[PDB]
Design a protein around this ligand. Structure first.
Ligand SMILES: NC(=O)c1ccc[n+]([C@@H]2O[C@H](COP(=O)([O-])OP(=O)(O)OC[C@H]3O[C@@H](n4cnc5c(N)ncnc54)[C@H](O)[C@@H]3O)[C@@H](O)[C@H]2O)c1
Ligand SMILES: NC(=O)c1ccc[n+]([C@@H]2O[C@H](COP(=O)([O-])OP(=O)(O)OC[C@H]3O[C@@H](n4cnc5c(N)ncnc54)[C@H](O)[C@@H]3O)[C@@H](O)[C@H]2O)c1
Ligand SMILES: NC(=O)c1ccc[n+]([C@@H]2O[C@H](COP(=O)([O-])OP(=O)(O)OC[C@H]3O[C@@H](n4cnc5c(N)ncnc54)[C@H](O)[C@@H]3O)[C@@H](O)[C@H]2O)c1
Ligand SMILES: NC(=O)c1ccc[n+]([C@@H]2O[C@H](COP(=O)([O-])OP(=O)(O)OC[C@H]3O[C@@H](n4cnc5c(N)ncnc54)[C@H](O)[C@@H]3O)[C@@H](O)[C@H]2O)c1
Lengths: 233, 242, 237, 241
């Protein structure tokens, strides 16, 4: 750990568990004030207790909720977040031959639309206030290579990568960087290790270390790319 | 006649690439079920090619299934070639993009391609039949493009969907592949102004925009047994663009 | 159509010569092994050529001899010549590295250049098709040299397409997965059983499967495809 | 990186010099290696007993001797190895000499292989963990007119690095590639103004990169913050499209 974010306000979605929680703890450790957002307000509050910081409830798949989140953060802190990390994400695995419409729609709405709506609301708040920023979207190596039983998740995560590339291209002129992180097999609540050259499963803190780099000025000429954190999977 | 045996279903068949695919597949001996949101345009395509026209909104779950049922009732077999060319753009900068402009593009381009891939695979597996599913993505799905966050997202999603589908369906003898066209003159792109359309042409090694026939030719290859060991991949038809 | 195929004496190169000659092409079959080439020719006026593609003079002379024999340049050129010399990075001899680079990468460069030079000076259009490997995209344990040489071919081919489109010449790479040929006879059956479980199509490729894709890329059906890679792997994951 | 010994090739100029400065600033001791002895030495002056080494990395004997000299000097193999030695000899494919091709392949691709190998052998024979960082280029992914040789070599470096990472993970050694875009250095000094202002229009961030931008990524890849990253490429291009 280092201290590269002493002036940062960081908004983290899916901050209530796993990678989101590890990200919140790491960014706070670097000096950032964290706006911890989760669908489950008590999970967001618990994260805040582990890190002034504040908890927010939001369903990021909802357009109204994504906008109101950003307005609430702005109200509370008197400024927009300069670091935004979209970690809210879900799976609902099924084989393509049997995937229900709810299986598909839910995953797309949370993982893809949600990331869209947060990127957008974040960028609007930064641009309207004349501020520089770093937006980091957690995708998955599955978005690059696919995975049996996960046609919905693979599509959503590929979509996040495509979204982030385009956002980077549009927002670079405004001083706003946009990057994707592609984790492999991470031990979280969401034979394999023979397939991992590093020889073990990843920890959520392994992803948070990369997110901290991308949130910091040490990546200030990095935008529109994806960084794989998979142990060489 | 590569495709003499075959029945082919083409969505978005009323226009541009879908129409050229229909013509091309019929030229190789296939019977074509030509589907479009516009029944009239589908009927027109069928006239250029017993082939039959079908009407459907592929973004709607019950319509995608009904389309496949309708074709099976008409021809007494499932289609063994299915080409998803139903697609739209609704361009806007990220900072200004409305929820409906996001939603509509994702519904038609991504959800529609999902639902058609699914219904097709289901019809084939249930009938013990081999097949080839070909989804038209875009090179913007690989690299993004300014003003098209929604489109870029949708087309990247089509590539991940197609890769995963390929992997689940190979054991059933069904191939799934994506075609990534570059800049193709169609009614989709006919509204794009010439001062930009000119500048794009300088970034094309082949020195000109593509024809729907160029995309059709790749689709016919992926439909045929000449591509029988190709699955889960994307073929770029861009003239070397970029 | 006049087609030059390097590595034509065996496996993929042989199958490509057969396929293209079946489509009406006249084939110049070239191989390090002169008897291998002649036998390819006898299996298919087609003619056999001997050359070590890794050698600059040999590559230029090959394209000289083809043009003196047919009175025109080849308008389809397929670089199938290539070797493996596998070893772990920790133990890889300089020789193991240099040979694979010389044959697979420099050889493909030399032939791509010599072919392009002949086409452009003659005012002829063409399609150059370079056989890389899926390993050039994802790498493979024991094959640091091969993976580098094959990734190299992909970079060379992308750049070559960018430079040559304006002269009516297309340049593409084919990336096969596991294809049953003499190059893969050494692979243990116990390893092949494993690999096969990871091919969604459920079987190894035949050289004919690669030849089918080369014929498409040789033909004008692929006339707006340049600077790209086509994977022929059965979905190998 | 207080503990660490870093070997940087191409350390006499540009990105290699920036990386040396950056690693030193984080507490590493730097073995600064260059074809030009004088340039390596000035880097050392510009910089915990840092030392200058001369080697032509494209020669197998010079790459093994380099690592032996480093180990003899420091009693330890370098645990961070950054291959920045690299050249261009640009020409159109139709006019490109055998020498222009050969030199670029030898330095950029064979040199990176030999140094990666020598570093890995030294680390493994001593039971030590490390991080090998190879500077490739965004042109290795997408190609570039007039640089058939450079593009082949940088694509080769990516393929080399992926494979190395898969073989060496089991020994505690990471291998990653850095893909810089358009960086202001003596390599790109001869690119004319008009091409540069046009290029700048292709960069979402709206300016050229600095050798320190690249050095910052290298320090990340050298540190334990990147402990679960191996066999991948990090792009530092400002969004260059
Ligand atoms: N864990 C892995 O192996 C892995 C691998 C690759 C990618 N990822 C991705 O990383 C991100 C974090 O995953 P994780 O492993 O920490 O999962 P997790 O379940 O531990 O955390 C996800 C958090 O997202 C929150 N969330 C879900 N829907 C939400 C919504 N609509 N609005 C707000 N919050 C919502 C949940 O309450 C939960 O707190 C996700 O994008 C996930 O897909 C995880
Ligand atoms: N034209 C290009 O430059 C280009 C480039 C890359 C990718 N593509 C893709 O190629 C495919 C075909 O595009 P095109 O150029 O033929 O456009 P087009 O407008 O000429 O053809 C699209 C057809 O899709 C039909 N359609 C629209 N919504 C539908 C729905 N919900 N259900 C069923 N049919 C529907 C339309 O009625 C139309 O007939 C699309 O997926 C497009 O995104 C086009
Ligand atoms: N077989 C596979 O599984 C596989 C997979 C991916 C890629 N490839 C590639 O396909 C191409 C052909 O492979 P194959 O499987 O047909 O192998 P093969 O060994 O059957 O054929 C190779 C031919 O290359 C010729 N050759 C070797 N060096 C030469 C040189 N310097 N000059 C001229 N000719 C030379 C040999 O004499 C031989 O006839 C190679 O580039 C190979 O790397 C093969
Ligand atoms: N500058 C850019 O825009 C850019 C872009 C992409 C990639 N790169 C890569 O970054 C690395 C550093 O480039 P740079 O811009 O700092 O170049 P530079 O010319 O400033 O420095 C390269 C250094 O390598 C040394 N060198 C050359 N050949 C050598 C050899 N055989 N053995 C040992 N040392 C040798 C040179 O003398 C020089 O000191 C190179 O691999 C380059 O290709 C640079």
């Amino acid at each position: 750990m280092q201290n590269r974010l002493r002036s940062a306000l960081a908004l983290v979605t899916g901050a209530g568990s796993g990678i989101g929680r590890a990200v919140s703890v790491r960014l706070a450790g670097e000096g950032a004030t964290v706006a911890a957002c989760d669908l489950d307000r008590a999970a967001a509050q618990e994260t805040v207790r582990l890190l002034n910081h504040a908890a927010f409830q939001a369903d990021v798949s909802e357009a109204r909720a994504a906008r109101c989140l950003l307005e609430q953060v702005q109200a509370c802190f008197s400024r927009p977040p300069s670091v935004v990390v979209s970690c809210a994400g879900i799976t609902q695995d099924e084989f393509l031959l049997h995937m229900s419409e709810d299986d598909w729609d839910k995953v797309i709405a949370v993982n893809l639309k949600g990331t869209f709506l947060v990127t957008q609301a974040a960028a609007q708040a930064l641009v309207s206030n004349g501020c520089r920023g770093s937006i980091i979207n957690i995708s998955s190596i599955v978005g690059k290579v696919g995975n049996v039983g996960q046609t919905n998740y693979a599509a959503s995560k590929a979509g996040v990568i495509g979204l982030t590339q385009t956002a980077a291209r549009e927002l670079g002129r405004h001083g706003i960087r946009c990057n994707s992180v592609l984790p492999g097999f991470i031990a979280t609540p969401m034979k394999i290790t023979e397939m991992i050259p590093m020889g073990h499963l990843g920890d959520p803190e392994d992803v948070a270390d990369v997110v901290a780099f991308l949130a910091s000025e040490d990546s200030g000429y990095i935008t529109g790319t994806s960084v794989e954190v998979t142990g060489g999977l």
